Amino acid sequence: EVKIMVEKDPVKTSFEKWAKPGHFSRTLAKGPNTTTWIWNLHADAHDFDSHTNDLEEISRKVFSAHFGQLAVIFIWLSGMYFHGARFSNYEAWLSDPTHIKPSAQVVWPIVGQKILNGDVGGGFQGIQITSGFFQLWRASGITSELQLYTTAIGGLIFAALMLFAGWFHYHKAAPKLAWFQNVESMLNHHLAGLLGLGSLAWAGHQVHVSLPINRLLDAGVDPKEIPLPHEFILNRDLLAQLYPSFSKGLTPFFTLNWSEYSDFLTFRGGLNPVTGGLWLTDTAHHHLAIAVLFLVAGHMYRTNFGIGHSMKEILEAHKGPFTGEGHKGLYEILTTSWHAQLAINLAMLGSLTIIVAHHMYAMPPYPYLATDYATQLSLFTHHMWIGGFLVVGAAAHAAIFMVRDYDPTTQYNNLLDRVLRHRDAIISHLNWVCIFLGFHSFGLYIHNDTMSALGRPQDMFSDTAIQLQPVFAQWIQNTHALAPSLTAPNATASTSLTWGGGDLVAVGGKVALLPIPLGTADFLVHHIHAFTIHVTVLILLKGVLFARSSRLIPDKANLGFRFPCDGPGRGGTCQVSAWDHVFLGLFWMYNAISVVIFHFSWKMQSDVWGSISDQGVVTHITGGNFAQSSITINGWLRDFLWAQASQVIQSYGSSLSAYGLLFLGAHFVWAFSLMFLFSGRGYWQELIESIVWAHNKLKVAPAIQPRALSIVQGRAVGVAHYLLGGIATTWAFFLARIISVG
Amino acid sequence: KYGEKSVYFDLGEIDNTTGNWDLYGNDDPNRYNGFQNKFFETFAGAFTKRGLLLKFLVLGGATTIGYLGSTSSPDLLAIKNGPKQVPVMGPRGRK
Amino acid sequence: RRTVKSTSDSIWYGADRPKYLGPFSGETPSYLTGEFAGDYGWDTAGLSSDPETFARNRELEVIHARWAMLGALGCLTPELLAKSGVKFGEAVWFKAGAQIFSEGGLDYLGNPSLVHAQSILAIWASQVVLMGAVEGYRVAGGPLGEITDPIYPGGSFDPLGLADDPDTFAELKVKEIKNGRLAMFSMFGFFVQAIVTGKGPLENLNDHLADPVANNAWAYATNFVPG
Amino acid sequence: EKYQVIEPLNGDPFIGGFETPVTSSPLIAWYLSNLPAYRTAVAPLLRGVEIGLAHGYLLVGPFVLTGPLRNSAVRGEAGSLAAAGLVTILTMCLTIYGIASFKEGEPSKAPSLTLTGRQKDADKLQTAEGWASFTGGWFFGGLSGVAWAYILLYVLNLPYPVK
Amino acid sequence: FNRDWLRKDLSVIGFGLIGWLAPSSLPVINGNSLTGLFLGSIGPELAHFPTGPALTSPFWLWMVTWHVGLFIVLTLGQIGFKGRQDGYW
Amino acid sequence: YIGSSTNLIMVASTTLMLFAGRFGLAPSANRKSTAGLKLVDRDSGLQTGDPAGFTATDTLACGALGHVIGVGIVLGLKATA
Ligand SMILES: CCCCCCCCCCCCCCCC(=O)OC[C@H](COP(=O)(O)OC[C@@H](O)CO)OC(=O)CCCCCCCCCCCCCCC
Ligand SMILES: CC(/C=C/C=C(C)/C=C/[C@@]12O[C@]1(C)C[C@@H](O)CC2(C)C)=C\C=C\C=C(C)\C=C\C=C(C)\C=C\[C@@]12O[C@]1(C)C[C@@H](O)CC2(C)C
């Protein structure tokens, strides 16, 4: 059943189609008549399933394109490593991590760009970076530029290998359709190899390289005097000097005396006091345990050898008296349509990225990362934005599947049909939830504003006035803080210092982590988050469920996935397509993520980050004003945007001037998007008619007829420039402020 | 809905066909006690007429609101209490 | 909301009776086909295969049950009253039968002006004779009514008229048999508790409520070993 | 495996709606049928009296515990007056709705068919006179309920956990 | 709509109670003992409800665990019956 | 070490798992379990010399599960006792 099936030389390698711009489409291949052709060409390029109708070619194209993206990522990684090997102060930073600002980008002297080369320290001039690569390299045990250069060369070699593999598997030996549909074998191989073996290999690297080097670095040994990584493998005496249990070899492993390895495979919470990061011995036991768990999990599904579970039978077995046929029919959908798989994977990847952001600020895994405030803020905001984008894409491509690949014949009385049959109730109840949340949270904010303006602060929803405490979150914090005594007795400390119990970790006169109190303002802000998230879900789910039909337009599935309207009739049918629902969900996702990152920035600056002096007295960056000033909209406007933007607007003439320039440019681009968002196509078409007359009067009219952008293109351009402007504004603001005060 | 078979359309039963049912309507005539009904029909029956109810509601609301507004004690309303501190001078000495 | 018009369908009489072993009851005696109150299909001894024997056992069970119900309430009330505060000659049930041997006699609620009986043989003979007479009236008719059913005569014995509606009648019959079987079980419990511990039910419950692990029936496990 | 709970509304697949445990259930159906709103054979005045009593009684608490005068010595009176004013405003709303909806000649609009196909007399609530009587009853009952709640809370002590 | 939509068994209650009390009671000073003790240790219950337990109490964790286990056992028991007779395996 | 308790536990776990594999007391390549855990017969194109149908795949699977169970038991007993 499961076997390798390929075709020899399916597509001939030639440059002939490179001279046919629209070869992939049967309508675009005829050439252009209007300027719409160019946009259609660049818009339909990578939409493979609209060109052909057979799954084999689509699957082969997807495989090769994924090879290409892998090659691009390898080029990017090689570039980062090389630019850190040649244009950085990584060694000087290694000597003095707490005073040297990381820097890996250097600008040329041309038009006054000199001012951007700041005094980051270590006898170096360059742009301060916030990607956190220095901390990752230090945790990996890298102590020289030669190792980084070797890694860059290896990355380039891997990029070449990925390019060759993509060419090979498209133009020379293309797998057949039966090869791609081996989902059981794919899950077995990926889940066991890619995850378990990769985690086991990283655990091996940590145990054999990173533990001794970082142990010596934390002790105080100068980086130039530390022996090279292979000297701990060729001479086990050194590694036994650092961790004495290595002197026993692998005998405790095979005799099940695993407690002998307890000095480098620990289970201890908290952070390293010297570096303010997680202990690397815990990271060793945990990448090892993850490897074991994934390797066990990967031997589950049935393949050529009889044993194992079959996913089709499992899906067909779980059904009950409330859901008719249950999960029947999903296997064919998920082995027949790429779009359903894309939707599921995008949703999971976005949620996982958001989880990564939370867990990474709460438990800083790298040395000297917690006390580098700019890196923490940058990483959190970046991966949060990425997760939001991915979760919106999930809904987009799920709606694409519903419009194109849905087949009512296969889905008679399963979960999909019954979901499509009670959609009005779902949307109605979710509408009520959105309205209820919006009122009882934002109205609380407006009530606070009005009470404060009227001179009645005793009638507000504040800690000193009427209180709204988050009792459930407080109880969860207290429970998690007392785990190392009752429910996880083998732990030394709690999972993170953010729980109520614990102490303060300070590295170089700066607070790394600290217990985070939760009060009325935190109650308000999490319920704001809940409001925005349920509203975004409402928009996207309404788009997905009503993608095929409604009461307004019974035959919406005939018009396609991406169409502007169905005319001015029935009162007006603008934006009835699932594409426009994604178009609005993008705006609401932007709103939600902006509120989330603002909450994170203000709360951290006000209650966690700060400078500590003798006698253990803590002074925070904004002096704990979040609890009192964040309960009002005026409080936000005055004490966050007005107060914290002083750095970006005063950065002219310093090394931070680029941040102010991009601050202004982003406000500009965001404003510029409104002219595409607020207007329509007919006005611009008529104006273009007049301009075309002007060009015609001088015999210089173009052969390709100019046309106004289509309706869908107008919406897409508006939303793209809008998102770019807003996100770049926040980027410049955050980076300027946190580089100045961090 | 004739209901004999999968037929759900019947011109004879158009209320069944259009689904014009009373989901929870209950027509049991005995709910309350006789003397309760006597008392309530005697007293609450005055407001049955609707135009008179409108006039009474408007006049009573206006009278109540005016009386409460014009006779509220200073210790309850701050606007009637008035200022109690010395006034603050303006920026350029303008009062 | 619909009009159900379900007239008479009682789950305690048909072929789908709950039965005493639940799912494990399986095969049930042929003669125990239901049709009588409290028919859980438990005749593993085969002592009611003859219909006459079955009827005699039914009547005897019902009368033992009623006697046990009365005895249970009578054994439990005076102790709770003493807990409330009313003074009695003997609180426990298994010692109050010898209060008339005390020269102070027997007193209702401890009040000397009530009963205060000192005579013994006369009152025992009187109660024996009158109760034998009422037993005869039960068996072979009498002034308060004519015997209709051996177990359920009725007539003047339901002055409140709750035995009118047959469905509520059957529900009341099964409720009576269930509470009576519980009462007989509690009588066996009271007798055994009097035998083994020599203490009244109220302090037995207090002891079980005080360190239940230490204070239970297992504390008297070794008190009867021979030798 | 063929047993299913969810069913089309009254067995007609082509009428918008489902018949679920939430919608149809002996406890839920009995409770909804025994509420005064669905007692179609009872005079609208008494139904309005009960509804007004319940609503006026429930309204007193929120206005007294939370309000501008909640920390003063006249909190109960202020809250009771606010609840009575809200009852008056809702009575005005009911009156104008009844005027705008029903005329003196229309027979009735309530469905006259039960779920089981039985034919019954349509409710007199959906009429001009019926709505007028219901509104008068609601006004009187709401005022009575507000007064009763005020009396219980403050005229007599009657200690309460929050009061 | 079937009146007995939740096909009435009413013996699943006893089986669920037994099958949740047997595992919970097993460990030392763990399980239903805590819930029973806190049910007894109400406080100044001589008249009515003593003010609710504070956040810093084990009562919340113990009660949550106990009722979650009981509900899981009851649901799995109800699915065990009525699903064995309808087929499904 | 050969007579040690850990060695005995590991060899017993592996032997019992292999015994339950070869004789129809556990699922294997040629004997599929249903939703009711019934062990119906399944035909695989794997040739073995064992007349009962026990293959090398079954040997590897049963040995792996036995090593897993034995390690778990040994660690649990060491932690408790
Ligand atoms: C280094 C990594 C790889 C880079 C690309 C390598 C491409 C190798 C050849 C691919 C095509 C293979 C099939 C040949 C056949 C093919 O493509 O079509 C076949 C076609 C035949 O044309 P003719 O006129 O010779 O024959 C027509 C017939 O009808 C009668 O003979 O064209 C050729 O033979 C040209 C082949 C080279 C075409 C590309 C030339 C330029 C390539 C390099 C561009 C960059 C140069 C940079 C210099 C610094
Ligand atoms: C069987 C049993 C309980 C069974 C309960 C069942 C089936 C419940 C079933 C149900 O839940 C279902 C399924 C479904 C629900 O819808 C309905 C019910 C009906 C609720 C308890 C036995 C319990 C048995 C007990 C406790 C026995 C104790 C014996 C002791 C202590 C003896 C002590 C001495 O004999 C010594 C040792 C020697 C001398 O000293 C003398 C003394 C002192 C007499």
Ligand SMILES: CC1=C(/C=C/C(C)=C/C=C/C(C)=C/C=C/C=C(C)/C=C/C=C(C)/C=C/C2=C(C)CCCC2(C)C)C(C)(C)CCC1
């Ligand atoms: C031929 C022959 C035979 C047999 C013999 C024998 C002796 C057998 C045995 C066999 C065996 C005896 C096998 C075994 C196997 C085992 C295995 C296969 C294992 C594995 C393991 C594993 C897989 C583990 C893993 C792991 C874990 C899970 C834990 C942690 C660590 C690690 C990772 C390592 C017969 C009788 C038939 C006949 C005669 C001859």
